[PDB]
Each structure stands twice: as structure tokens, then as C-alpha cells.
Amino acid sequence: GATAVSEWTEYKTADGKTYYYNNRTDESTWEKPQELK
């Protein structure tokens, strides 16, 4: 299970979970990208 593939990067929030942010979509999803899964 890798982390941060280019355009996709995830940060863990204080509540203890990562949100996956795609930069050139500008989208934020709580599901692991299939390029990063």
C-alpha cells in the first residue's frame, strides 16, 4: 500500500483518517485511488 502518487496525495486528519486529494481534478475523496491502491 503506497502513498502519494503524483497528482494524488493523502493527508491524515486529527480524527485519525486520510483524505485523498487529486490536484488537477481538485477533488477530495476518502476512498483510496486505484492508481494508489
Curated annotation (Swiss-Prot):
Task: Tell me which tissues or organs this protein is expressed in.
Answer: Detected in brain neurons.
| Compartment(s) where it occurs, according to its Swiss-Prot or TrEMBL record | Nucleus
- The signal peptide, as residue positions, is none
**For the WW domain, which residue ranges apply?**
2-35
UniProt induction comment: Up-regulated in brain tissue from patients with Huntington disease.
The source's superkingdom equals: Eukaryota
In the record's own words, the domains note is: The FF domains bind the phosphorylated C-terminus of the largest subunit of RNA polymerase II, probably mediate interaction with HTATSF1 and preferentially bind peptides with the consensus sequence [DE](2-5)-[FWY]-[DE](2-5). The WW domains bind Pro-rich domains.
Per UniProt, subunit arrangement is: Binds formin. Interacts (via the second WW domain) with TREX1 (via proline-rich region). Binds RNA polymerase II, HD and SF1.
What is this protein's function? Answer: Transcription factor that binds RNA polymerase II and inhibits the elongation of transcripts from target promoters. Regulates transcription elongation in a TATA box-dependent manner. Necessary for TAT-dependent activation of the human immunodeficiency virus type 1 (HIV-1) promoter.
Q: What is this protein called?
A: Transcription elongation regulator 1
Q: Which organism is it from?
A: Homo sapiens
